[PDB]
Ligand binder design. Structure first.
Ligand SMILES: [Fe+3]
Lengths: 130, 64, 66
């Protein structure tokens, strides 16, 4: 931003060919960090910080990933703490466990379509579906 | 993030447990591969775990 | 990559002890950005950009967390 302090290093001691090597903005700098911290910031928060005990904190407002092929997470465990709005097909290869009422048009169980299934009643006849 | 997080990827895998702590939503054919567990499965508006069929001799069957 | 322009700053004015402080590549640099930006790039797209109104855009091809 305008107002930053630059270090101009003239080449060949001419006051021309002046080249700015570093441009610091002391008004918008992160301060009071841990001994070994390396990151990238912006002039209002927005810190992608890598801290001591293997933590890649990403403090931002609206993160928007933009991939072209795929996105592999490769983590033994991941939580979300919020709503998820997957807009296409899902797939799970493990014992998924829900804790509230689930809703769907029909639940094809083992190939047998629920919402249209008919049992065989006591007196040898198809039981009305429900 | 303070507001929302958009992934915008045609395909994404996870390779591990997921512990979504709030409401889920899928607009496509969500195919599972193991037993699912829920208090009840509201199917097409008909609440499973309380449904009663109409038996052969003109009467309600059982709630199971 | 080869062909980048470096600023050699000789120490003690000897033409030895030459140290390269900055190595710019003007051929592969992001241009025409908003007033306040800060990111990291690669010589074909791949911008992890921080934009004005709290947007941490991550434009890549196949992002792989580990
Ligand atoms: Fe039934």
């Amino acid at each position: 931003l305008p107002g930053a302090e630059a270090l101009i290093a003239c080449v060949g001691a001419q006051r021309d060919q002046g080249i700015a090597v570093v441009v610091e903005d002391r008004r918008y700098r992160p301060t009071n960090l841990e001994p070994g911290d390396a990151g990238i910031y912006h002039h209002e928060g927005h810190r992608i910080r890598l801290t001591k005990d293997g933590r890649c904190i990403i403090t931002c407002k609206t993160v928007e990933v933009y991939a072209d092929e795929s996105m592999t997470v490769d983590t033994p465990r991941t939580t979300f703490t919020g709503d998820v709005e997957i807009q296409k097909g899902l797939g799970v290869k493990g014992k998924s466990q829900f804790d509230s009422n689930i809703t769907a048009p029909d639940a094809i169980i083992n190939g047998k379509s629920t919402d249209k299934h008919i049992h065989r009643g006591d007196s040898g006849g198809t039981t009305g579906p429900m």
